[PDB]
């Protein structure tokens, strides 16, 4: 259950009660589509249905022809597998492995073993189930349903080609054409991972797609194979807390804690994720990619309870930009009201239920439905949870404008204090 | 590529017998093992499948030892109806289609 | 998936052809257009060996006399010329569905 | 009609003549699709057409199964409505309201009344118009057109499922599958808003989609309902002006006004939109989202006419980065040429018509078709309008390099002057 | 062939061996679809196939109705062509030019000549090949294949309308519906450019789409015309080198070269591309858009070999943020290990093959398959190439923490030295 | 949309069934597959009350004797047994299109 | 859920009459009001619709008073042909399909 | 694409109609639904001039007596009344494919 | 819009002749030139196409002079079989369909 704590001292709110799902690795699987080497239907005729088949075959052939024309690094794992498949003889390993089965584990040249699955076999359908239907002597097809089912089978290839063409062979998220939900669910079950990870990934397949990649690998020897790069969640169920920060100004000099974003416990240390796009959030599970993470000591949590703790140097910025704004946190909203701008909190039925005075203040999502700051109307999150207000004297009142260095784009508590002490030393 | 099983076993009802299956000629971890029962005068019957890649199990307790490339099947509460030949077949490593290309010579368990 | 197999006994004169049919209760066409139907042979005193691994694909080392045919729910195994080494029990198997199932088996003899 | 004024004093161009359409609120409507609870066709047979229906039903069932697996906050309004629909008994309110009509207003538990519209009824089609067609005894369908029309009806569900699967249940922009153009046009007409807003939204439905959201809400009790979160434009037809800025350097020390972006009048104050993605621009209408807005006093406009005005503190940055670049404004282009880099303005027929000297200069779109600065070829906007050149002495010549603080990433005129005065005080 | 050089002195790696493909201009072509002015099928009847045709015609009519409702500037070239087509009489020039041919060059009012191509003619199909099929007396269609082929012809229009509706008339990348691969390949061949550019664009059509734009232009007088804005690569085969940088800290004060990104030779000067999204990279070809480029003197390359060169002022940043991180370069990975965080390089088979000590170090992709820094697992790029390690004393050891200005968000070697000298002057 | 209704006068003996048909000039199937055709009853001296709200769905409180049927452009209202309380005027209504339209009305009597 | 209308009105030609319709038993703002004219010896005729949610109007001037949950219909330039019973029916609040589930008792206007 | 044209000699009496047929070896329908088949006339002593530029579209300045017809692979050129100025050689041309091809030509004469 | 070609040429076998084609009445750079050979007593034969917009060439060496709006066709190693009339026709500027609307008067080359 989610719990929010607003700290009036630093105008920051921490939304605890979350559980982690941190992507610490990648799982690369090879998805193969066996392609027919057909060039055309041999006969020519005036049948309208066969012309539709030829039109669909032209779509098929053009799709194959289109495919043949094709900090960290997010696809380094799938690119590595793709480059191995380009080596001589590695395609025939996949061809022989999937000769009698649709799933196989293939040991490549590097020694890595990758699970290979054949999700579609157009070579079988076209050569064995489509071409024998065509009466070459009359160049006619008996039933129209053959045309319709050919369009359905070929449709997945056309959409896979369509996505690779516009994404230059690397698509993210992995769509349902690359890997259907049943295939993705079965693929997760087939991964050599613990049951806790399988339960986590199966319940959140929509998050798995958003964090996955599809890499077009080979189009050679009647095989269309692309590497799907699924995420591995090695860290699960560890506590997470999101730090929401809003400007804190005198009522002038402003102060804002810059270290906002998600924090999660990881192997005795705190993984900090500054970018907002990094972490996807579910009911109470936070899916943060560790590639965009900073590893911090566990003492980083002490900045919430004590901004002047000696165990850590909390990051803040200093400026004179006394502009009113509101941060719509979970279970509430931080409202910073300054100047002549009027800030109010409103309810759907009762209307304006609170008028914010000058300073930084917090309103829970209970009762409040919208927040108005200046000319901007903010809607608050209606998540169920318990919000806690921690009253305290704002830290911005301890400084003085004469020596406050109000130009730090990114600094820390100790850096500001040392720079202040330098100002006092000169003065 | 071959599979060799344990010798014939004679047991009394209510006991437990663990058949083994030693693999050679291929990478054990790239496949799974399917166990098939053949009662005398009766057709083949699929019992269970264990993957050497995932550890996944389908259906008696089947286990695989990757280090020794050996698969085990233990049948508990043996009855007179459990007198049959038990085969191990190399199978799909994941939830695909089963093929059972290579079979062990067969362990005759008598109860 | 019940794999009905017919006939159960197939006494065949040497050199004459033999046909074994095996009809499934459901269509064996998988999500991918393949139909994973296997044919096994159990030589007397030996473990079953795979002959045909998809409806018509002979396995490596299988003589050309063994031909597989069929589609959908009905399948056929044919031997062009029955020799002394063709005596055995033949099982059709499907691996497409969750649980592999075998046929009742066909006992081929010599008249 | 658009009018551009270039200020040589500050190397800034203001593109006036625009009208505002500011999104100040949200309108959430519930779009429902009634789903059939069919599990399969009871019979089995060898008919090719029925197999196509079963294949399409499997797509239907998998689509339902896929759906069942599913600062500010842009979707706080639609999430709030979605969370209410999850409450016990709220689904049956929608079920009973839409029992005899395809549009209804439903009063939820919170007391909010939301317009609910049923755009597709797959429960009616499958149960009443599809299943009775199937001859269960022969397991055959008489005509192939039943298969084709079933694919058409089911197509919208599959695409809605497809978009929610890859977007994790929140899609923006709202595609034509979520809400067709006729449905969006009728929905705007059905909103309880003034006719000026309805005319604005109806003429710019393409902008409305880009600023809308679709939130997957419920898949329970044979109802697929998703909340479409349309924008509300409470501020219309107010003047807007875009401030284009380019570096101003001596011919060295550079100066650039950092407050570039859209400004629009709003309730006696100026709404400033720094981000470029915030504002969509039409013929003369600017669609700016107020969530990404700063509220400023009306005196902010005085920075254009007088950079040293006492009524406001204009934001500038200072640096030594004397790099030539060009800003392609509307109705012209600002060209800053420095160093040995050659800058020219060219016409399609007459070729190079002007060679820019050292400094910051402006060329109208009349005659000029391309601008070349260094190795970069810039095409100018051919918008029809009247450009005005305001000759004046550049402000960068008033300072001196000895005390100019050329390291401010973001500062103001008064901050620079105070820091300069501090430098003179020490010296 | 790619070659990497790691410089221990500045903790920077340069990945040479690349060839440029710099977009220096645009090529705008008009793609036209002739539309039928049909309002409906005159007859009414109970035929199921004709109802399908009417349903598809309603999709056709709604698609037309949907279309009728529709620093630098990336679409200034295509917008200019679009605005000319809106002039009176310019549509009839295209109508008459394409009267007997599907490709023509049309001289517009501005005098520019644009290649116009008609990729689909729905006016011909509907009026001449669809309507005559409908037996108006019986209101019946003989064969279902007419319905299926009508859906195929109309499908491209619906998808083009679909993309313009959600993109507000400007789509990028240019999908396969806007311009198929055969049409794009033929369009490149038809451009008045040298054969070296044609070979470059034809081999990399996937990159061409990602850098192209499609602008919806006119829907008037039975003509749907949209301007496709293809890229022009005036600079080809010139050397490129990517500069990878990682923090360099004492083992504290940190130093990092901020000028990371792609550099390419261009007309005797170096084009620097800071943004990562600007440059697409192929096997050894780098496709950088020059709109996001900085033009620098050729002496910028001297910063790699000598950071204290007088010919250039290399850009660095200074901070106290002693945080361990790794930069996954091509042909290797830079690992900065500081504090108590453990950093290791691992191989798939041999496991951990190296443990990084405190400082900045580099490991080639030979042998190394993954890199672990703190709680983050980084996969290295397995690109084939030769990496070179240039041992040298890190420059951060030359300074002293007492006068090191560790707060520069972006500065240079000379700026830091002058600021240091100012600190020494006071002290 | 002209809603032709037939017959205009329906004298029915008590207990015998009665059928009222109403044919539309256009197909009443909406964009969503529903066909919104309503049936109203105007008891003498009272306002019209809705009986059937979609082609066959009885309204709450309507006795089961009232049955609605039809599809496309032709529809039917049937009464299993005409009682003394079934005397009135019945109007078919379509609400699907822009302007709702009613039928001419059927005057049910007793013979 | 019911609708009550004003009493009978007697007017001379050329005058104006405003019928009222007081709603109770439901939320007035969640629906609209459709006005239906029934001339003596003639069928029902839809006149106009006004939404209590939007204020949208379709077709005399129909208005709604949300505070008193009352709808009004004013007919100007009354003629002898305007002698009819005018009904108010609760209807769709938006541009959907009209259903008219609940009707007022009817106001007889005589001219 | 071989453009077979028939007949090669067409002696026509003045005022009577004349028909020239030209059959293609392939369907001339382009990717866009148009069929680009042209008809040219070579007046004696002059260069060929285009009469019909798509299967039925007359060129500017061409008299209405020249009518084009056909679809797919077979096409027809018809003259309603042959005059003294209609004597010449007529060539059918396709430009749709990579290489334009002409017919053998029809020599129209007067009897 | 017209095309004028060079005069008649008489050559000996093994020589080279360059036909010219001066364009007027239209923008030369907006089109291409297709060259057609007509041997005496033989039909038209397409030789080559050159674009004045791209410079692209299809098939002797055809060239265009944009400044003088002139197209040239040079035939090397002239033989007795090359005696024919050579026409220049205004054509498509790109890889579209060829139409050849306007033709030059024809250059008779005799070898």
TrEMBL record, chains A, D, E:
Biological-process GO terms, alphabetical: entry receptor-mediated virion attachment to host cell; fusion of virus membrane with host plasma membrane; symbiont entry into host cell; symbiont-mediated induction of syncytium formation
Organism superkingdom: Viruses
Primary residence: host cell
Cysteines joined through disulfide linkages: 11-360, 43-139, 240-264, 249-254, 279-288, 303-314, 337-343
Keywords: Cleavage on pair of basic residues, Coiled coil, Disulfide bond, Fusion of virus membrane with host cell membrane, Fusion of virus membrane with host membrane, Glycoprotein, Host cell membrane, Host Golgi apparatus, Host membrane, Host-virus interaction, Lipoprotein, Membrane, Palmitate, Signal, Syncytium formation induced by viral infection, Transmembrane, Transmembrane helix, Viral attachment to host cell, Viral attachment to host entry receptor, Viral envelope protein, Viral penetration into host cytoplasm, Virion, Virus entry into host cell
Localisation per UniProt entry: Host Golgi apparatus membrane; Host cell membrane; Virion membrane
Membrane topology of the entry: Single-pass membrane protein; Single-pass type I membrane protein
Keyword Coiled coil included in the entry's annotation: yes
Record's keyword annotation contains Signal: yes
Annotated Gene Ontology cellular component terms: host cell Golgi membrane; host cell plasma membrane; viral envelope; virion membrane
Record: glycosylation sites: 421
Family: Belongs to the paramyxoviruses fusion glycoprotein family.
Subunit structure, as described in the record: Homotrimer. Heterodimer with fusion protein F2; disulfide-linked. Interacts with host NCL; this interaction plays a role in viral entry into the host cell. As a heterodimer with F2, interacts with host heparan sulfate. As a heterodimer with F2, interacts with host IGF1R; this interaction activates PRKCZ/PKCzeta that recruits NCL/nucleolin from the host nucleus to the plasma membrane. Part of a complex composed of F1, F2 and G glycoproteins. As a heterodimer with F2, interacts with host RHOA; this interaction facilitates virus-induced syncytium formation.
Biological role: Inactive precursor that is cleaved at two sites by a furin-like protease to give rise to the mature F1 and F2 fusion glycoproteins. Major determinant of the species specificity of RSV infection. The trimer of F1-F2 (F protein) also facilitates the attachment to host cell by binding to host heparan sulfate. F protein is involved in the entry into the host cell through the interaction with host IGF1R. This interaction activates PRKCZ/PKCzeta that recruits host NCL/nucleolin to the apical cell surface where it can bind fusion glycoprotein F1.
Name of this chain's protein: Fusion glycoprotein F0
Record gene name: F
Full-protein interval shown: 27 to 506 of 574
